Structure formats: structure tokens, C-alpha cells
Design a protein around this ligand. Sequence first.
Ligand SMILES: N=C(N)c1cc(-c2ccccc2)c(-c2cncn2CCN)s1
Ligand SMILES: N=C(N)c1cc(-c2ccccc2)c(-c2cncn2CCN)s1
Ligand SMILES: [Cl-]
Ligand SMILES: [Cl-]
Lengths: 9, 9, 232, 232
Amino acid sequence: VRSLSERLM
Amino acid sequence: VRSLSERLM
Amino acid sequence: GAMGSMERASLIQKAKLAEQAERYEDMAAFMKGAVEKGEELSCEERNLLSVAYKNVVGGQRAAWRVLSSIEQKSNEGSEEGPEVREYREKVETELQGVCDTVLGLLDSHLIKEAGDAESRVFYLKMKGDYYRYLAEVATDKKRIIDSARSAYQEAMDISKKEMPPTNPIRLGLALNFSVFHYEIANSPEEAISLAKTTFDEAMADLHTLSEDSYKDSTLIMQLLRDNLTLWT
Amino acid sequence: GAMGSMERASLIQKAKLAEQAERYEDMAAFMKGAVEKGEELSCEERNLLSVAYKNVVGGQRAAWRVLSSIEQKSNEGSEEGPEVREYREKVETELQGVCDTVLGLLDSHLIKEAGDAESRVFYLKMKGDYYRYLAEVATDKKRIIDSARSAYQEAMDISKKEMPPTNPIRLGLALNFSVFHYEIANSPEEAISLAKTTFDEAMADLHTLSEDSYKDSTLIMQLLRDNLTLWT
Ligand SMILES: N=C(N)c1cc(-c2ccccc2)c(-c2cncn2CCN)s1
Ligand SMILES: N=C(N)c1cc(-c2ccccc2)c(-c2cncn2CCN)s1
Ligand SMILES: [Cl-]
Ligand SMILES: [Cl-]
């Protein structure tokens, strides 16, 4: 499982 | 609304 | 052809990898390369070809519909430049290029070497599908529609003679031909009649099928049923 | 540049159309063209640039992960050719090309002209992100990691001096830097500490925000929280 990175606004 | 066409097997 | 240097088996292997990776542009290029080796395609290979290009053109049709909608709204109390039209034309031109690529492969030379019903019907249906995708954006429009109709009809004739009513290819063909009637040819009554009789004739043939063939056929029949529900 | 003949405003307008059409390759090309006009980017234009390339590279990273996984399984009781490696290398090379394109735009010349915190931090964070995407497939690996770290750290220093703890760009920067620590730099304790303090310092600043700014910040904070839940 991979960490969550910034999502597009 | 658009008709449903053949789906990939 | 940029794939001319790669082994046929390697192209097929990589098309399957591209499918798993959901890289359908790569998948189309690999299968185009495979076709251009000159050998006929197995049932599996034919479906890999169909999967790749249907996804490619599927994204173009969705984008084209968005842009066309924005373009039509611009042409109603709407404030005005040429950018919407230009970009819609760009996607449209790219869509047509893909459709011509597929039709080119069928014409050179998949169809003329396809003797068995499963292969010939598959390719003729595909020809109808991609002339239908051209018709969706056409405004020669009539000839495009007739080319789709003619391809679908030749496929229907063969499938009715050579395939059982529950054959998935025959079912998918009749489904798409009924969509053509309803969405392209302005023949909703033909579309409804074809979907009805296709469903009923398949229903009456399910008793001959294995559990796995029964699942395959009924899955496609449900789409016929869903369309009838929307059409009536 | 193939977009050199198109007006800056037309490129921006078409990038927005491409976004609505989910045509992110087109969107990247349009925004690359816009950047190459030489003018600095507005906040909106900066996010259009980020949206386009993040989606493009996002699809490449997902495909690369699938292929890498298949490649590792092949190298365990596994039957053997070079196709898996070759095709993974193809996607990887295409991914690296996209990352170099973005880093090229930031270096020529978005960053050196970015004087305001919102723009400078945004570009330096972006530089860290795309060196991080390079690090994900690297095996010069150390220099790539250091380039990401250095870009993120310069961005962190500016954001801590010039932006409130709840600033969405600062929050997104700290989130991605913590991901870098955990997934790239083998520093899970640094990742957890950064996520904790970023969340807590933003929590204590929410009382200063409007309803709309509160929604923006808390949305990003939730990702910090979700990562902490997976990390601890
Ligand atoms: N890689 C894909 N997309 C597909 C591959 C195959 C296929 C066909 C024959 C032999 C092996 C695989 C498909 C197929 C199409 N009709 C039925 N099948 C298989 C399910 N019974 S679909
Ligand atoms: N077309 C897109 N993808 C985006 C456009 C904008 C944006 C930014 C400024 C002005 C107008 C639009 C985005 C944005 C990024 N930070 C906040 N916003 C807007 C929400 N408050 S995101
Ligand atoms: Cl255009
Ligand atoms: Cl390859």
C-alpha cells in the first residue's frame, strides 16, 4: 500500500 | 442518454 | 511500420502487458504491428486488437462529445473565438485517423483472408463499428452510414446462417447494429425489433449451453434488455 | 515548439477544454506552449500546468508499477524472454522524458522569475515532486533523491517563513515531502513527525479561516491524517 500524496485542487 | 453497445469480453 | 522489427509473438505478449497496464495506445500499436506481419489472427488475438482500439477510440469519442456539447452551447444568449471549434476539430481529426487505421487493417487484409464465421463476422462487425464511429462526427455522411449498414448487414447474414443465436459475437453484432439503427440511422423501430428478436431467439437457445457459455451469452443479452428499457 | 504559433490566451483556453475532456496529454502540450511564451503564470495557470502533467505522469507511474510487479514476479519457480523488461523500460523511458520536460520548464525559466511565495513554493514543490517520480524508477539514484530533498527543503523554508500553516500549497508541500521521506528516503520517522506537526499546526490555525478556506485546508489535512493512520 502506497502513501497518499497531494491531490489536484 | 446514449444506447449501450457491445462491451469488451 | 515502427513495429516491423519486433517478433509477432513479442508484439502479442506486449499487447497483453499493455492491457494489464491499461496502456491502450501502446496496445493498439503492438496489435497493428502484429496484424502487419501478414498472418491471420487467432480468436484471442482478434479480441486483443478490438480491446486496444475500442479503448483508444472510446476516449476520443468521450472527449469529442464533451467538446461538441461545449461548442453547441457556444452557438445558442452566449458570449463569443474559434478555439472551441478548433480543438473539437483536432480531437475529431485524431478520432477519424484512428478509425481509418482500423478500417485500413480490415481492408489490408484481414477481411479478405477471413473464411471462418467467427473471424469473418468479427471483422465485418468491427468494420461496421468503426464506420459508425465515423458517422457519429460526420456532417459524405450518407455514404459513411451506408458503409456501416452494409458491413453490419453482411455480418448479420453470415451470423444468422453459421452461428447459434447465443453466440457472443452474433449477440454483440446484433447489439451494435441495433445501436446503429437507433443512434445513427434514425430507425428506432428497427432498433427495437432487432433487439427484441435477438433477445428472444437467444433466450430459447440458452438450454443448449454450458454454465460458462450461459454466463457469456446472458451477460450480453442484458445489454439488449437495458437498451429496450431505455427505448420503450 | 509546435504551440509557438498559437496565442497564449488560446493555449490557456484550450488547456481548460482539454481538462473538461480529460485529454491530459493535450492539456500538457497546451500548457507547455503557454509556459514557453516567456510570461510568468497566474495561480490558475500554475494549477492547470500541475493538473495536466500530474495526470500524464500519473498514468505512467501506474503502468510502470504494474509492469515492474510483473517483472519482479518473473525473477523469482517462474518460467522465462526480454519482453517484460523491454516494455517496462519503454514506459520508464517515457515517464522520465515527461519528468525531464517538467523540470526543464521549471529551470527555463519559471523558478528564477518566481518571486512571490505562492509561485516560488509551488514551483519548488513541483521540482521536488518530479525528481521524486524520477527516484521511484531510479537504480545517479542518490543524486536524484538529493535533488528532490533539496527542492522540497527550499520550498519548506520559504513556506514556513511566508505562509500560514493552513495554506493549501504549504499543506500540499508538507504532505508530499512526508511521502518522500516515507517512500523514497527510507525515513518513516521523519515522515511521521512532519505529518504530525503539519496537521497540528494547521489545526491550531483553522480558527482564522473562512468557511471556504476551512474546507480547502481540512480536505488536505485529511490526507495527512490518512497517511499517519497507515504509517502508525
Ligand atoms: N485479453 C483479452 N482481452 C481477451 C482474451 C480472450 C481470449 C479468447 C480466446 C482465448 C483466450 C483469451 C477473450 C475472449 C473473447 N471471447 C472469449 N474470451 C475469453 C473468455 N471466455 S477477451
Ligand atoms: N482548472 C483547475 N484545475 C483549477 C483552477 C484553479 C483556480 C485557481 C485560481 C483561480 C481560478 C481557478 C484551482 C485552484 C487551485 N487552488 C485553488 N483553486 C480554486 C479553488 N478555490 S484548480
Ligand atoms: Cl487545437
Ligand atoms: Cl517495448
